[PDB]
GROMACS .gro file of C-alpha atoms in nm:
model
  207
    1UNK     CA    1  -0.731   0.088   1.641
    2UNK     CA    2  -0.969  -0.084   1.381
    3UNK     CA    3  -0.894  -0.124   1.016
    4UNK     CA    4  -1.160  -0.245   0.809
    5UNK     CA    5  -1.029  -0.371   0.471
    6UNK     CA    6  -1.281  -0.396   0.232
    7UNK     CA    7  -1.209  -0.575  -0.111
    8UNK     CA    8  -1.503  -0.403  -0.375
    9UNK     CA    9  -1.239  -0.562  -0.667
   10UNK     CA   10  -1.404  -0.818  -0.900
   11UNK     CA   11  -1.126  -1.029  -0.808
   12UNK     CA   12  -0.965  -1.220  -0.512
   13UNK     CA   13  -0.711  -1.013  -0.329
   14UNK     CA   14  -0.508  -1.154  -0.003
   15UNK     CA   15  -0.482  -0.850   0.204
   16UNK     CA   16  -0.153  -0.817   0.402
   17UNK     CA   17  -0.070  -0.562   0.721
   18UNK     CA   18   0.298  -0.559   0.873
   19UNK     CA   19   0.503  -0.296   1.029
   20UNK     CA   20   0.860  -0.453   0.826
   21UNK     CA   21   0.953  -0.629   1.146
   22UNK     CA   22   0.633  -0.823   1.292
   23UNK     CA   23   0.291  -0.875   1.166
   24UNK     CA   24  -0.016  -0.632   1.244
   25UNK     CA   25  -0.303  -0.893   1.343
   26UNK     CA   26  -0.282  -1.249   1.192
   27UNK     CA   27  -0.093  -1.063   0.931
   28UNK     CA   28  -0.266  -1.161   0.626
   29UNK     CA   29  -0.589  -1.272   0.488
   30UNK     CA   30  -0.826  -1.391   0.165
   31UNK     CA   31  -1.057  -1.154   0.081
   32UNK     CA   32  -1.270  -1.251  -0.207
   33UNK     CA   33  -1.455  -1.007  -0.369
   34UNK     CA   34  -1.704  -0.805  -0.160
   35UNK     CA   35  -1.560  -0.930   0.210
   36UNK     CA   36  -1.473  -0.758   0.486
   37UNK     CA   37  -1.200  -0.796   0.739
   38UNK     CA   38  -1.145  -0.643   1.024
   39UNK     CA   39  -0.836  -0.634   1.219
   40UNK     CA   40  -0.659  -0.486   1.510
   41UNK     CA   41  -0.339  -0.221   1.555
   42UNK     CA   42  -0.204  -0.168   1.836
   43UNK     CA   43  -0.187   0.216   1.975
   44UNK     CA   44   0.150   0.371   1.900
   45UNK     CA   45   0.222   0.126   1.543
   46UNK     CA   46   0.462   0.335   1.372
   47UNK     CA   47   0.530   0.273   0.977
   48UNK     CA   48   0.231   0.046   0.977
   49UNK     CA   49   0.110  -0.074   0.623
   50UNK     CA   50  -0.170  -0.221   0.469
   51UNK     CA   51  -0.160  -0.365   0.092
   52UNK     CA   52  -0.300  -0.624  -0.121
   53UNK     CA   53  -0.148  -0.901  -0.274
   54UNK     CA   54  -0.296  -1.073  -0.652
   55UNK     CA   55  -0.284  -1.405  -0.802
   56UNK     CA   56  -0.168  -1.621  -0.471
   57UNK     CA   57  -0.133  -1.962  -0.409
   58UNK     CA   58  -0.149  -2.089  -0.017
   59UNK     CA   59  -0.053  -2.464   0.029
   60UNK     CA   60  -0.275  -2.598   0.351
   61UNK     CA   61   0.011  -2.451   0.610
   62UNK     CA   62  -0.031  -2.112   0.491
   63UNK     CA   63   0.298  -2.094   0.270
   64UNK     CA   64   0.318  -2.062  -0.098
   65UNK     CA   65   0.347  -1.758  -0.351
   66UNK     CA   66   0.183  -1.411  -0.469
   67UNK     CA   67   0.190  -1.226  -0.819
   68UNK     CA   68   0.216  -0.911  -0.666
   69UNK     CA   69   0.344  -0.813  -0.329
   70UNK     CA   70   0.466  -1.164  -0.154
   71UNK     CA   71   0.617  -1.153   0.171
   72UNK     CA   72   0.823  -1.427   0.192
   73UNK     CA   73   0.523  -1.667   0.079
   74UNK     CA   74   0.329  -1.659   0.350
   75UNK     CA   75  -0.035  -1.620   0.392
   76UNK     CA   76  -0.012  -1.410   0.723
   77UNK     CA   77   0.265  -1.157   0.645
   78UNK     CA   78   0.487  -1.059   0.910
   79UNK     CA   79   0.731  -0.887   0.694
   80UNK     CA   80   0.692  -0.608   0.375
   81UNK     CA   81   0.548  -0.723   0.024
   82UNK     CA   82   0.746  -0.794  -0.278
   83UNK     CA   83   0.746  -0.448  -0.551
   84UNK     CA   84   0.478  -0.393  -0.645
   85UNK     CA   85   0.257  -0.319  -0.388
   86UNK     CA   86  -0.021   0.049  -0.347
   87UNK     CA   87   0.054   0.108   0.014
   88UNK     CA   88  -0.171   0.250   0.256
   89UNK     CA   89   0.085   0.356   0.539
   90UNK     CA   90   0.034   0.481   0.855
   91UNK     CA   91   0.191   0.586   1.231
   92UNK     CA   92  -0.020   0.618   1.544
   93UNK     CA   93  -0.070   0.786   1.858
   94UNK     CA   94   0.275   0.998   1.752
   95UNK     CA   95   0.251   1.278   2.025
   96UNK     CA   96  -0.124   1.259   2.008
   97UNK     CA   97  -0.195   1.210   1.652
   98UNK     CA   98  -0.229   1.002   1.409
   99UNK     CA   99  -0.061   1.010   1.032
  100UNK     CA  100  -0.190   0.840   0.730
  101UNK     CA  101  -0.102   0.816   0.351
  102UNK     CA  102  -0.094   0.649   0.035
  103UNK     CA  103   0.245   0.561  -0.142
  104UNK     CA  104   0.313   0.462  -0.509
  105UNK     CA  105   0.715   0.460  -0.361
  106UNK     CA  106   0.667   0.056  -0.425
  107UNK     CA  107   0.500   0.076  -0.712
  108UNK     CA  108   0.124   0.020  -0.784
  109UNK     CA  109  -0.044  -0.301  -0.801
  110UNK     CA  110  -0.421  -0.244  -0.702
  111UNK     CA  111  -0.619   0.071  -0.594
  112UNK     CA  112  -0.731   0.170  -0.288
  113UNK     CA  113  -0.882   0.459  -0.075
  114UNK     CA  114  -0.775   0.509   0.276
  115UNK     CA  115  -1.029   0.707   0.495
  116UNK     CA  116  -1.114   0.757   0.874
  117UNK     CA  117  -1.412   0.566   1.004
  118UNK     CA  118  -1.432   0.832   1.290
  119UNK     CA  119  -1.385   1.246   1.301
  120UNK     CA  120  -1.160   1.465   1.259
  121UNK     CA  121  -0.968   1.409   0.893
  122UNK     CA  122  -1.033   1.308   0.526
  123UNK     CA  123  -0.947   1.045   0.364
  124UNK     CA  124  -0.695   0.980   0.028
  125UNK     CA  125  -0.726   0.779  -0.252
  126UNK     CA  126  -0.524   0.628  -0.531
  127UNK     CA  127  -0.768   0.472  -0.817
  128UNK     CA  128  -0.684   0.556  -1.116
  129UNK     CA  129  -0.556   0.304  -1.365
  130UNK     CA  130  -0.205   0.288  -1.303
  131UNK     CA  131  -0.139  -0.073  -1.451
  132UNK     CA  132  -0.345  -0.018  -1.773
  133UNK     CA  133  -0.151   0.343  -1.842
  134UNK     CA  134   0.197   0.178  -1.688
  135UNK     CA  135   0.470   0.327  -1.904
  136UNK     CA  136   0.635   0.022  -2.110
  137UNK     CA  137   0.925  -0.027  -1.860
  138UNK     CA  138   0.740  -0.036  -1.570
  139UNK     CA  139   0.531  -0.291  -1.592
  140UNK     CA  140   0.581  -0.572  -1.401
  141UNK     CA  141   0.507  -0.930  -1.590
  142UNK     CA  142   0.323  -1.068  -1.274
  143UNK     CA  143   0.124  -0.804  -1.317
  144UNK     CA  144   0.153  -0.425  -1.164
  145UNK     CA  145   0.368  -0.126  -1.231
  146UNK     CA  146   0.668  -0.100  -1.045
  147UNK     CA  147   0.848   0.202  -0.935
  148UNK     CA  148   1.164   0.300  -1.086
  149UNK     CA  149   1.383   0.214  -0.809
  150UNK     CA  150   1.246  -0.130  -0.834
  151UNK     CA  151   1.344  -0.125  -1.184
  152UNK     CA  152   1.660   0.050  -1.236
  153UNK     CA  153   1.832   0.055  -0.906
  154UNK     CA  154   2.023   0.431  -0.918
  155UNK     CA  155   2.051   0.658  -0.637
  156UNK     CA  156   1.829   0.940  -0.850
  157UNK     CA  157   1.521   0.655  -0.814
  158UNK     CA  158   1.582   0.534  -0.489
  159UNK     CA  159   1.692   0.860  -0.300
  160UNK     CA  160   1.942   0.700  -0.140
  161UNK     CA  161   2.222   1.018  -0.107
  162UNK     CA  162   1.873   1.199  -0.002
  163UNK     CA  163   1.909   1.464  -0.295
  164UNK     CA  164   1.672   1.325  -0.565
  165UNK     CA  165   1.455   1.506  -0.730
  166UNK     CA  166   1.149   1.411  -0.943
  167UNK     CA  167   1.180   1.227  -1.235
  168UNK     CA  168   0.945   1.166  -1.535
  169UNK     CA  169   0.848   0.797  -1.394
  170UNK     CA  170   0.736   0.976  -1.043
  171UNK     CA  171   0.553   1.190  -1.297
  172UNK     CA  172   0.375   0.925  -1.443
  173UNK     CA  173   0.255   0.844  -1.094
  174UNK     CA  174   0.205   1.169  -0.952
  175UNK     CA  175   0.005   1.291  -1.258
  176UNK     CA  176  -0.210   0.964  -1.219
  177UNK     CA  177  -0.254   0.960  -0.862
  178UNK     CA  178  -0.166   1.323  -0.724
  179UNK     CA  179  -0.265   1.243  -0.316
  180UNK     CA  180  -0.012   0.956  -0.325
  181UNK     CA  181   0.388   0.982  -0.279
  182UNK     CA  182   0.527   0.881  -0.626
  183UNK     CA  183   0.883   0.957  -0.477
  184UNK     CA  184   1.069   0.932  -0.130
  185UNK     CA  185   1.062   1.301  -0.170
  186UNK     CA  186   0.786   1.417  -0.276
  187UNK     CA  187   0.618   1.660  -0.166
  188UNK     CA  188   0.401   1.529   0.139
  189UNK     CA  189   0.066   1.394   0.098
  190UNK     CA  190   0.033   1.321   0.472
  191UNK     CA  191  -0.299   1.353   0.661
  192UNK     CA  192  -0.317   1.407   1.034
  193UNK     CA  193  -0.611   1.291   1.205
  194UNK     CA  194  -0.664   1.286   1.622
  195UNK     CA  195  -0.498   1.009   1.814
  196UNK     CA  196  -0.679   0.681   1.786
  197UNK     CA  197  -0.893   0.711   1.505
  198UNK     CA  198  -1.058   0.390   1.321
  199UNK     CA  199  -0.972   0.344   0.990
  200UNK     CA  200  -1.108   0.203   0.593
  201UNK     CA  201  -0.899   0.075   0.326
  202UNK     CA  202  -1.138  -0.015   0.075
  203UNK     CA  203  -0.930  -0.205  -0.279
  204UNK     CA  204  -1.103  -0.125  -0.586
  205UNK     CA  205  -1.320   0.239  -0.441
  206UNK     CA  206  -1.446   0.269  -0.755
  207UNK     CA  207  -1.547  -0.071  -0.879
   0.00000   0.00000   0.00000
């Protein structure tokens, strides 16, 4: 499957794509404002994500540091990014279709929209301005607005005895971006599309 990652930001991001465990492509790329890359996924990726990083630093063998959404400093990611990160996630080819979504589960660091290039499904999009309206303790210093798990560390943020409900920081991100998960419960903002469909994730959609 194609990917086309489009940066329409006025500023520099290094795009990153992983599945937690192994890089998706080279892994990770400079995209300065207006570029285009393309990359590759593999049929049947499952918990696939795309993000961008901010403010980074690459020494000449690739290693080095990110503001928002490092993966263990390295240009090409083969790993997740550092909190926080806008996450365009997606599994393919699961019994003959494909799933897509947008999460604010790790926070919010840049906006994006994450469409089908090809028929069959819509696309969702998280671009309102989640860093400017970041409530106080939220906001992340190297810029971004992390999620409360991030941040506090309590089984009610991070879901972990699976009983959570919302709370009024997956508010804050639900209200400002409704077609993104602001919680690992949440009710789903999933899209299904057929099998093998080519993909956008354009940073900045409205810039």
């Amino acid at each position: 499957a194609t990917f086309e990652i489009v940066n329409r930001c006025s500023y520099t991001v290094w795009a990153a794509a992983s599945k937690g465990d192994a890089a998706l492509d080279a892994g990770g790329r400079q995209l300065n404002s207006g570029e285009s890359w393309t990359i590759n996924v593999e049929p049947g990726t499952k918990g696939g994500k795309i993000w961008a990083r901010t403010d980074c630093y690459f020494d000449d063998s690739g290693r080095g540091i990110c503001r928002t959404g490092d993966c263990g400093g390295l240009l090409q990611c083969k790993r997740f990014g550092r909190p926080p990160t806008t996450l365009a996630e997606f599994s393919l080819n699961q019994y003959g279709k494909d799933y897509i979504d947008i999460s604010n589960i790790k926070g919010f660091n840049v906006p994006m929209d994450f469409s089908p290039t090809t028929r069959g499904c819509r696309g969702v999009r998280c671009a309102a301005d989640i860093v400017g309206q970041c409530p106080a303790k939220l906001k992340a210093p190297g810029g971004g607005c992390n999620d409360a798990c991030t941040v506090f560390q309590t089984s009610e943020y991070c879901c972990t005895t699976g009983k959570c409900g919302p709370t009024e920081y997956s508010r804050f991100f639900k209200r400002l971006c409704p077609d993104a998960f602001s919680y690992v419960l949440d009710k789903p903002t999933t899209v299904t599309c057929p099998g093998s469909s080519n993909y956008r994730v354009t940073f900045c959609p409205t810039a």
